[PDB]
Symmetry: T
Subunit: 168 residues, 12 copies
């Protein structure tokens, strides 16, 4: 439970850095589960929109792996251990595996819209906790939050009507 | 008048997103009018500083078109319509056409200094409204605001005396 | 009404250059309204063909902005003022705003097919006027005309049946 | 009928190289007919999946032209003549012209799935013959075989159901 | 015989576009037979000028494949079917297969000089027909014609005496 | 247990492809657990060899993610589902989580040497099974196997004595 | 006087090609004298606009050297000798040396405006002669003519008043 | 003492901009002293970790020079003088010269850890002052602050034990 | 004589790895002697085919140095010492120095054809030994073997008659 | 005073290397003060030549930082300490701070002309001392000397009359 | 006759700089006549070595134009006028026009060998004069001299026998 | 013994060029033995500094191969034979094979420090001989000498104490 480090970034108290490390450790499991899950969707989409969807996920895979790197190294700068192994991720995460195997591209985009709502709400909660402890970490998380919301918009636009309502 | 959307980014209430969409819709007209107006200046500057000024505007044209893209796609992620047609821009804008045709480069930089003061003050007002609704949109607008102020500094430096006063 | 310049390109009479400047000034409003309108479509397309259409417009936006630059600088070389501000564009243009807001990608491609027929016919009329005044301007416009017709073909191919007929 | 060369790669008997040259001469007609046929599909696909399919074929055109180059130069290193003219291809091939003209993108992907099954089975037969004569040629053909099967998977994924069955 | 399309480029009558489609369909067979034939020469040249000739053909292969792409897509924009399969090419062409197998590089350049005279004269005839129907297609063909004549000059320069006469 | 697909690559029987899919599904969990574990080591190495080790893992992370992509897409071409989610990986894997948190770089290289021996032996077993079913899949796995053994050599070289013995 | 070649481009009569060779031989002296003269200006401009002018000439030097290459190789394809030595240029040219040594940048731009009027009028005369003999050569010269006129516009813009009149 | 400018960025009062100019003038001396000091360390590190440390500083030198450029130009946009000369830096700074000459790489990393704690605490103090005056300057400084803390983490990781404690 | 290592790649017995190390140690002397000998030819070719031959060897020098690197590092991964010094190469090699000094390009290509037959036969013998010990090493050597045979084909093509016979 | 090192470059006596180290230590302070001073000018130039001057300094900043790196590493190879901290630079230098704050671009170029005369004369004196001790160091300094004189020429050209006299 | 400048590079007396300006003015005519003459050869070589020779001259054209730029700008830094117009070149040069029009590639290489002997001897004489006046100019000319001699070696190697004698 | 050539670079007497050829022939054996020996070290370094040392040698391998190319081609321009075969190198060299097989990275850097002292002293002796015969060759060797001494400094820095003394 106690992640207070032995040293942290100058200007931050160790006990406050331990609670920021705990916030970022769960956000790192979320980002690692999200890029594993985006590659799963990339491999297992079918149907007449295959190539478009398959190609559209690949730059988001790369962007999310970059976000996970930068959260992990911020954990390490704050004096903590960035836990990246999948047994830890599955033991500590607060959401279930993505549940779609092979499916049409539009069905996967519906399920990925729900994945991204969980991730965006987790990041928004983490921004608010980080803003009370360290503005440099808060700033890193706010830029990531906006990029994740914009890729959820590309997913949602495929499900959206001319009148601006979402199917899935 | 009412731009409340049917869905918006997770974590934001729809009525608050409608008023952020309205703020960003006017900032998008300002950014589109600004890159049209920078190309107009680029084409219609003359006199002995032509090539320097002509070349100096071109990367700002590109940067401002990128800013307009990112405001437009943030409107769409918030559930709104990014209106990009010039009849709408002219109907909804709260400033007049840039009024200089062919002129010396230093005369155009004087008039563009006034254009950028309007744009910078509009963006600063929009930062303050967005900061009450969504920190991710506020962050996007603050980085744009600083870039626009820095390009206004390149315009102003041409008009500035050794004692640090501005001509135009 | 009278756009006869004080100097023009060697070998061209000033009064003939004024009427070529008038032809190119309207073609420049058309090209500026077209790249504003292509970005509007890019931002406001939805439905299951979103990413494909959204991505397909972006290189045409860039190509049309390049065409507008080269018409504007040819106006300036002919001794005229390339008017690039949106109030002038809306005051002088001979067509209405693009009328589609958010819509499915296939609906926008129908409406953009009609936009491009207006632009292609305007450019073909301008080629024929320029060919009587200056072959160098005629040549610039003919290459632009073919590129615009080829991008209208990519729009039309989405609307076309196996038997070679167009829906919209 | 007899393609025994006057010299061949060190370590290979000339009569065995002549029969490998005959195997590779037909595989070269197949690869040349396939990249001509992929460009034909690229030009003549229509309907709402146009741009995605049109763009997806282009890197496979390039990859298949590279495969044909490398089979041809291996024929020449083995002491034979790589016949690349279309009258020879049509006289010696053991399959018919691709039979689809203009058609929807999904209809062309159905017919291209059948083209690729012929090509993949021809390459697998050629791998087994080359493996008895020269492991260096067998290795070249096995890497090509896998790349062709992976591009047939991109074609098939467009035709595949969520339960993993193929339409066409 | 009748290739009148159901739609064509704005400003062109359908019956005139059908006869331009027929002109460009044969020019596309010529360009496809030429890049197949240039690769054949590339693979089957021998003797002490091998590497120079072999390397010199490769950028012309790429340039001619680009010319075929642009004629094909202009056929499709004019409302026609760009026929790219080799059985159609051999059935409809008005010239014979290139007749040289393995040969010295200078012998192949002699035979390729004759191939290019046929192609250049076919393109010049097509420029004159296109100029009566559509200046945009005429312009595309004139630039291709000059590039093909310049690569025939590189072939001819190898066969030319100090006094400016051609051997083959 | 039964992964026989409804279609597979031409030339392969479906029941044999199901058992190859099962072999590759476990090799894909191994490659995904390995690149998650390499990033974990990258973030959590300390001590005087930090930067060298930290930098040396990064191209292997990229190479292993590429290997996982190519195994996954080969599963999909063979007619199977490439399972990429971490709950499935942890449920189906036949090895335990990497057990080192923060540690000196040389301690992590000792533990990663043991990880790579498991991965290399799993890949060598999979090469031998694939070689009985499909040479194209066997070839993909043999190239991956050699690359993984070469990166294990870079890990082992740090642990090796001048006399060629390994510490850890 | 007589430059009729022994061979020329297919489709052109030799006597007509000799007179086109004579037209292009003088246009090649003009383009070679122009890029020598642009480098002379680049080296010998002074005063407070030095760096801007000095930098602005360099891409035009490169563009004009490219124009000279393409006229020379078109002379050679037409069967003639592209004479590139400076004693021939000075013996055959119909204009005098550029007469400005070291001078302020604005004085050199005045004198270069007069150089470019001679070059543009020579090219326009050559376009009209080439259009009667060969459309492929006419097309090459028209694109060069427009590029030269656009760089003369950059020179003239430095000399131009807000009312659109030229000083020098 | 009084740095109130004659003009400043729109929306900021001049007296408040003078105190922000004073904050940023000292942060600019700190960033210039830091990149001079990083190059000093790069040149004067020795011992068995030489190349790793020497190479690791070079991208941070480049990043810190970029940070100094952007603080300086923000001073100039706010209406102030960015003082970059070393006599001013040494007269106005509030810290002493870096005191290590030639030394082992690990000794220099100990001393650079102390340099970076001073710089990070100075930047955090400047973020808090800028946040009361102008959010655009505050945002620039927060991103710089995080990058400096992350490079201090790379320095500290070399000094850190497996249990997460720092030596120097 | 005994090169059995203390450790080797997982899955390979040490005594079998020692005999593979001995096979690869001689193949590494052959590849190092070959790239030294290709540079010798590059420097010492003369006569009218100089530039073509001189340029054609340079990418093969680079490719052969890459082959030597990859054999050496495979020796090291198998637990052996990759001996790269020239006294060892000359003591252990089973062929004589290349014997041509300055000579015409065609004479050097004759002698290099004989060098490559020795190298290709040595590599084919090594493929067959490696295939009994380790498929990963066998695969590396088979790809190298084919590349070396293809560059011997470029050498032989210069010596080959139209009827497909070799001079030297 | 005594900088004789414990080792130096082979072939140089230690006492002679100590006096070369002293020469290069002062040339390194001069080059570091010059690139700090060029950035100061870049930030603090104003008036109608701003952008041209501002842009023209930036590649010289980069070139001078490269010169300082190469002098510093030559000091270290000669066995000395390259002192890079600003307190040492200000204590040991033999010239005063650059004295211009904000000023017009032409005023700064006058003062920078005087800075460069000091630097060029210091480098010429150092070339003559190095030529008596070590030709490799002399060669490095002569190339730097010429580059510095050429950038002083770009500064002086802005101040020079048509008759070749300098203002400032 | 008298080229003493009004200012020159620091450390050089004006009268000595005038005589160095005269040396470099003639070396600049030689380098400009040489790159005009290399392009002439490039355009007018024929026969079976055409492409090799034609391609081999092009990088030397670029290198010689760079040498002329750097001599010209060194003249300007020394206070002189770099005369670049062809009437001056022909009036002041001390050699005749290159005398070969269209000719076989080997005949042109013979004549270019004689051109380069004149240029190399002129540069060697200029190195010796510059070494008495200014080591920075001497150094620039020595590097150019070696590059010109190495390109003369590529020309001579085409004319050289196996016994090391030159034909032409 | 006698290497007087039949022709040499203009301005050099043949007998003096023969003795420069002999000097450069031995410097070429030294540079070829050095890049073979650097690759040997790269492959056979072990222990905890492996990756840093292994990576640090690779750009020096490339730089030394470039130095050998440029000495060889200067031998050929001087009229001599650049002998590149390893039997000649071992017969003519005046030093022994590098004697370290597998060893820790720091042991190899000790032995490579001694190799580089031999090479640097050989190059310094060759500079002094070349300076009496030809300044262009002397200049090439002086730049190589400095680069080799700087890479010996990177080797020595790993062996150096804080007080500036070398271990090995």
């Amino acid at each position: 439970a106690d992640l207070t480090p032995k040293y942290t970034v100058p200007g931050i108290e160790r006990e406050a850095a331990g609670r920021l490390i705990g916030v970022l450790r769960l956000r790192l499991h979320a980002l690692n589960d999200l890029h594993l899950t985006l590659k799963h969707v990339h491999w297992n989409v079918v149907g007449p929109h295959f190539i478009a969807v398959h190609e559209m996920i690949d730059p988001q895979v790369d962007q999310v792996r970059d976000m996970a790197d930068d959260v992990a190294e911020r954990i390490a700068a704050l004096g903590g251990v960035a836990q990246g192994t999948p047994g830890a991720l599955v033991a500590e995460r607060k959401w279930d595996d993505y549940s779609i195997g092979r499916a049409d591209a539009i069905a996967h985009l519906g399920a990925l819209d729900v994945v991204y709502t969980g991730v965006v709400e987790g990041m928004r909660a983490a921004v608010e906790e980080a803003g009370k402890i360290d503005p440099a970490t808060e700033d890193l998380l706010i830029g990531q939050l906006r990029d994740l919301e914009q890729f959820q918009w590309f997913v949602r636009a495929h499900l959206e009507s001319a009148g601006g309502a979402l199917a899935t």
